[PDB]
Amino acid sequence: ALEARVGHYYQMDNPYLVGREKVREYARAVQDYHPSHWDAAAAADLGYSGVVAPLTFTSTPAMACNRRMFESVVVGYDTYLQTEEVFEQHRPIVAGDELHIDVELTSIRRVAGRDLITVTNTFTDMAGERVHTLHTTVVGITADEISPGTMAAVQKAMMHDVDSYIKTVRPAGEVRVAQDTARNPGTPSFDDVKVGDELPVHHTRLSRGDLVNYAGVAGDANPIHWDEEIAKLAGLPDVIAHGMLTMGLGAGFFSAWSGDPGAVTRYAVRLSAPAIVSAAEGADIEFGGKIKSLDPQTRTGIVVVTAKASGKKIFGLATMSVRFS
Template sequence: MPQLAPEAPSSAATADQRHFRFRDHYEVGREKIGEFARAVQNSHRAHRYDDDAAELGWDRVVAPPTFGSVIGLNITRILLDTALSRYDLSQILQTDQVFDIHRPIMAGDRLRSQAVIESVRRVRGNDFITVKAIFLDESDTVVLSGDTSLVARLGAADPEIARLVEGIVMPRHSIADEPNVLTAVGPEEIARIPDLAESRSGTPVHTEPTFEDLTAGYRLPDSTMRLTRGDLVNYAGVSGDPNPIHFSDRAAELAGLPTVVAHGLLTMGLGAQYLTAWLGDPTAIESYSVRLAGFVPVDARSPAHIEFTGRIKALDPERRTATILLNATSGGKKLFGRAMAQVRLS
């Protein structure tokens, strides 16, 4: 089991309080899927219409590949209110995100959540926290598992930032005192996460490029997407991310940023659209991971532009999958330190 660093804060989860299940479930609505798809510019019709999802082999509207971030953000908040209560959300920076999609999330799903705090490491005065989240459907089948890496700055929050947040952000209800919102369990009570090959065996894909069309080194067509301040405000509301650096110039200035910046997971969501536009089938994306290395500044008077490129790193003829390396830049600056997707092909 991963160990806490010797100088890790005493309020962090202890060795026997690393495995949790959540009291409530998340009921996936088709309207929420549509709102999220619009917010991350995922335009495939299977995110909106049952008959288009049926053409891909699914009987209900399917969620975009990064939809799990909506549920994951709530998991992070609950952990910060309880097991990781030393840290403040305003001092948390997300650095890495991995989604392993065992089957697409669909409208009508009632998803239960489990979480494991896999490690807390102290490095140069910051704590690096890794959390694994697991979403299960009503039959206890793993639908999605995800790993999130966070950097927590230690020490008291800047009082000016605290005053600013109090003045512009909707007050957040703390769930720390609610009964049984989070239950510590033994590791044996956490669901076994199957291999993607096991989960995906026999599931349909309808991609436009076929496995036979591709070779290692193949370059995907380049694509450019744009973001406005309105896109950022919309994503903040749909995703539930209240960080004011994404809509307040003053907050961005206090954080040392040149201007308001886009959410890292919004940029990741745009990358999912880049993949889907090429594949023709959003459900063909099995795994998608990004290490965030830069930010997209979004001026109040003109949109920002993000350029996406990709190439095939490897092909697996047994499973008919491709490993794709992605690159994203804005204003000539790199946004992803490392981004990779595994996709199944027709």
């Protein structure tokens, strides 16, 4: 009976208008200084009508839209932790886009005593085209899996936010998926890259304040990312970075190498160990990558992206699918 509500679907009445300053703010929060996120003229030189949203920006409106799904529709868990994400950038989102967002409970799988819950959001522009698909997998955590009174401390610490079940499913209809094939990407020539090419390693540092800033900018209320006492009560070794933040750092690493955040068509990240962010040292995340495959017909490729901190892998398998020039 875990599966009874799978398929549940709802749309948000209000679309989300992507704003230039909010785009810059999210880029700042993920330490992403690619000029296309900041400078409208640099974005225009790459063929974009406004500053480009960093790839993981969609996490921010999606989390707000998913409140009903995780608090009311999915029953049986006190809290959740992200384990895996897939970002499909059908076309890059730019400032000025106004996007209608929906939510669908796509699966609930039980593996090795953990319930893995996948929700999917789609973002549809004013022309009715699907510009982005986001697949979020979390593990559901029940009351008995955390210290007694941990949830009461969590509820007490969380910010103040004012807001019989009937299943609804996605209506029938055809999807018009956006594409970006007309825009030449600002990436290396396909002829200048080779399978097996390794990316130069980059270290990104995170402080407690980076996580506090991200909590507000992305609207993530969970105190495990900013209260050491609650993080330990939840069974963690210390405060940990938001999974979405580390994925955003990976996308920034990748676009610093590639030259064009919009040239990515798909970013898939399995998470492994959490990135611990201590008060004394912060975190030091080492990113790397290696070209896995190239397709000369489409002049595209797949690049593995790696992420480690203090001897442990932060990412399991993670890949970028990207258009070359």
